[PDB]
Amino acid sequence: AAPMAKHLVLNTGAKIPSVGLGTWQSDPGVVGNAVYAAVKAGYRHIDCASAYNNEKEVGLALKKLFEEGVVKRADLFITSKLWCDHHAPEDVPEALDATLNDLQLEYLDLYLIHWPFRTKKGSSIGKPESYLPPDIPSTWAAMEKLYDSGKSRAIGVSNFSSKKLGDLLAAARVPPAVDQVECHPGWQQMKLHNFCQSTGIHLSAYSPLGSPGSTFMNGNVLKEPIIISIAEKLGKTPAQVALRWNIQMGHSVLPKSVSEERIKQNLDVYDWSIPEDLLAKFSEIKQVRLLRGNFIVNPQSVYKTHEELWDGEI
Numbered sequence: 001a002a003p004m005a006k007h008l009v010l011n012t013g014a015k016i017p018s019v020g021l022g023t024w025q026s027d028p029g030v031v032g033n034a035v036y037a038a039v040k041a042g043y044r045h046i047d048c049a050s051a052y053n054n055e056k057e058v059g060l061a062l063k064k065l066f067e068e069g070v071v072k073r074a075d076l077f078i079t080s081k082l083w084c085d086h087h088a089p090e091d092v093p094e095a096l097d098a099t100l101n102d103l104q105l106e107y108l109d110l111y112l113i114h115w116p117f118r119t120k121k122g123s124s125i126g127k128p129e130s131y132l133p134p135d136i137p138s139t140w141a142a143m144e145k146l147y148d149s150g151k152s153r154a155i156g157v158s159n160f161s162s163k164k165l166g167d168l169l170a171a172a173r174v175p176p177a178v179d180q181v182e183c184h185p186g187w188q189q190m191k192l193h194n195f196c197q198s199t200g201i202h203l204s205a206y207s208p209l210g211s212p213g214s215t216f217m218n219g220n221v222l223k224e225p226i227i228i229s230i231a232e233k234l235g236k237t238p239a240q241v242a243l244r245w246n247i248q249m250g251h252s253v254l255p256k257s258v259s260e261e262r263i264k265q266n267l268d269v270y271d272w273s274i275p276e277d278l279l280a281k282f283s284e285i286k287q288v289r290l291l292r293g294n295f296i297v298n299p300q301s302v303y304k305t306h307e308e309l310w311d312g313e314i
């Protein structure tokens with residue numbers, strides 16, 4: 001039974017560690033070492049997905065950590081995600097079993113619907129011929145079976161707007177435990193934050209450093225003067241300040257890195273805080289969604305506009 005500090009409580013009663021290692025766009029050749037180093041450094045939460053094409057390499061690192069006695073299975077919170085082409089009820093358990101085979105696990109702590117979007121089994125999502133209308137209640141009922149069987153100890157969604165999340169909550173027997181979404185100082189998700197707090201759904205922040213591959217204007221939010229300024233005042237890195245902001249909002253954060261030193265720095269967000277007067281200044285940062293869902297917004301999609309995909313949250 002995990003402690004209070006450094007965790008949030010899910011609506012299941014389970015505790016989610018408030019920092020996890022992101023593995024989105026982590027190259028299969030280096031993710032193993034990243035996972036091993038992360039857990040060695042004190043991470044107790046790994047965020048994975050079938051779609052990231054690297055769960056086998058994550059699995060090898062978990063196996064190593066367990067065999068070396070660094071951690072036991074019960075010490076880790078492991079998340080994976082259901083891809084768009086496995087939304088049919090018989091395909092949901094097939095996807096989870098494949099994921100569990102790759103991660104070399106018997107259960108997940110959390111399993112998420114990756115997007116509110118559906119495609120034909122084994123199709124390429126880049127082609128409109130692949131598209132199918134979502135049936136989230138149907139897919140969710142299949143997810144509820146995994147919850148009931150203990151194959152996933154919690155179930156949730158990813159990239160659901162407040163509206164879509166609310167609609168699922170109204171329809172579901174088992175409420176979503178988590179909505180995993182882009183959340184960082186440049187996209188603070190105050191509407192979804194408030195909705196989540198009001199309904200008991202956990203907001204988990206992906207891309208908590210914005211877009212490190214970008215220039216300042218294109219999404220490197222760590223170049224915001226306010227963040228730099230606060231970083232200098234508190235003797236921390238801009239990344240640390242961005243992450244701590246999210247922590248103080250009561251979110252979990254999922255910083256992705258394959259650099260051991262960056263992985264270590266990204267965990268140093270607990271033994272200090274941002275003063276209330278400095279925290280207020282985050283309200284001045286320009287708000288722009290960086291992961292806009294372009295791949296599923298087009299004339300052939302159920303979402304003809306970004307406003308439709310995000311129910312106005314853009």
Ligand SMILES: C[As](C)(=O)[O-]
Nearest residue numbers: 024158159206291
């Ligand atoms: C962090 As993502 C774009 O795989 O939902």
